[PDB]
Design a protein around this ligand. Structure first.
Ligand SMILES: Nc1ncnc2c1ncn2[C@@H]1O[C@H](COP(=O)(O)CP(=O)(O)OP(=O)(O)O)[C@@H](O)[C@H]1O
Ligand SMILES: Cc1cccc(C(=O)CSc2nc3c(=O)[nH]c(N)nc3[nH]2)c1
Ligand SMILES: [Ca+2]
Ligand SMILES: [Ca+2]
Ligand SMILES: [Ca+2]
Length: 159
């Protein structure tokens, strides 16, 4: 088994309902078990700002799935929760499930890049992650606690 860490975001169609439904669906992923769910946070949008605030959270998911098999399931859940692709980059969505980390693995395939390429620059990913895994060390040896101690991130407010 490996512990994967998944970032959850939603800013459309009742984010609380979307995130709760996503947590139920994550539990139903085969060869996998949810270990920990963070608090829910209400966060101002990064990137384009002409959209509603996000509900952000993080989940620790123990799994024996291959990394791309996990991706298959997370994409399926997003699509089943009505995620529609629009042309605007970083536009609003009913559900976003980003695989932040897959154990200590470094993955670079056509469909999957892990660690998430920008997570070390996003408070809305790092703070919920720290809540559920304060001892976390990245594949490159960097400590999550040290990033959050050193770098300026705004405090997150709970939903
Ligand atoms: N770690 C990861 N988690 C989820 N999807 C990933 C991923 N690495 C690559 N992908 C790929 O990313 C593709 C596009 O996903 P999108 O959700 O449209 C990007 P986004 O989440 O809006 O922006 P971001 O990646 O800057 O957070 C997916 O179809 C998937 O194949
Ligand atoms: C550091 C940086 C620069 C430019 C863009 C971004 C995004 O996160 C774009 S997509 C996105 N996803 C979320 C999200 O899940 N929550 C919040 N608050 N904002 C988000 N924005 C991050
Ligand atoms: Ca399961
Ligand atoms: Ca994302
Ligand atoms: Ca995504």
């Amino acid at each position: 088994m490996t512990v994967a860490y998944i970032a959850i975001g939603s800013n459309l169609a009742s984010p609380l309902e979307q995130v709760n439904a996503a947590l139920k669906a994550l539990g139903d992923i085969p060869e996998s078990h949810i270990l920990t769910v963070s608090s829910f946070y209400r966060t101002p949008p990064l990137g384009p700002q002409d959209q509603p605030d996000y509900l952000n959270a993080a989940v620790a998911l123990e799994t024996s799935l291959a990394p791309e098999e996990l991706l298959n399931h997370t994409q399926r859940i997003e699509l089943q929760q009505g995620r529609v692709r629009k042309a605007e980059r970083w536009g609003p969505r009913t559900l976003d499930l980003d695989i932040m980390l897959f154990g200590n693995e470094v993955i670079n395939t056509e469909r999957l890049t892990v660690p998430h390429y920008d997570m070390k620059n996003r408070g809305f990913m790092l703070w919920p992650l720290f809540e559920i895994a304060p001892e976390l060390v990245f594949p490159d040896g960097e400590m999550l606690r040290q990033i959050l101690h050193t770098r300026a991130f705004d405090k997150l407010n709970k939903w």
